[PDB]
């Protein structure tokens, strides 16, 4: 039925208390909705967190607490840990139907801020004969795991190709990812400078090359 409104993504630190909400568009949220909260740890791993707008344990930490605010449900995490970093989904019951929230993405910074090492690759030999020129920009060992990647061709900001990926975690817990710039050989053989500048917070690490 309605629109279950959840936070898109929130971040916090160990020892802090975090507040998540879940809004019902039909209005006041009651026991007739049987508000449920589930947890999805990043291995596409799911588990129930709180039901009955109250009920706590299958063996769920005392620090996770759910409630009913007025026109929405709230999951408060008091004494937030790093292993709480997961995706939280809400669910309201209207009848004969279950509606889950968008899911609140909670990141728990549990390691120092590290920066990305970017390495720009130009199109290969074998590839350019295929009328295609794929530029690759690898982003490695960056924490936290959020980056935006900007291209400019011959100083010209690119709105095309830009295939950036979501950061996947590395063995060292940091993140890595790459961004691709595909186009035709003619295009490739048309300019001189191709640059990839990565955004991880307020600092943009650029990486260029003048093929010719």
């Amino acid at each position: 039925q309605a629109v279950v409104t959840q936070e898109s993504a929130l971040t916090t630190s160990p020892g802090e208390t975090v507040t998540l909400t879940c809004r019902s568009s039909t209005g006041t949220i009651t026991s007739d909705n049987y508000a449920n909260w589930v947890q999805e740890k990043p291995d596409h791993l799911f588990s129930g967190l709180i039901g009955v707008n109250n009920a706590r344990p299958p063996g769920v930490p005392a620090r996770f607490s759910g409630s009913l605010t007025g026109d929405k449900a709230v999951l408060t995490i008091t004494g937030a840990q790093t292993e709480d970093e997961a995706i939280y989904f809400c669910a309201l019951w209207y009848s004969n139907h279950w509606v889950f929230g968008g899911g609140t993405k909670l990141t728990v910074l549990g390691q120092p801020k590290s920066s990305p090492s970017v390495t720009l690759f130009p199109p290969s030999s074998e590839e350019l004969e295929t009328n295609k020129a794929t530029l690759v920009c690898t982003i490695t060992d960056f924490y936290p795991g959020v980056v935006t990647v900007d291209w400019k061709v011959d100083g010209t900001p690119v709105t095309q190709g830009m295939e950036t990926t979501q950061p996947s975690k590395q063995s060292n817990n940091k993140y890595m990812a790459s961004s691709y710039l595909t186009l035709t050989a003619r295009e490739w053989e048309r300019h001189s400078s191709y640059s990839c500048q990565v955004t991880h917070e307020g600092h943009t690490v650029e990486k260029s090359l003048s093929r010719a």
Partner: peptide, 25 residues
Amino acid sequence: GLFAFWGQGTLVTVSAKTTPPSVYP
């Protein structure tokens, strides 16, 4: 009183054709 324990999930994909990759150095 909730969606307590879940499955590991099963992925379902519908689409097009099979193609080995073209690898470049």
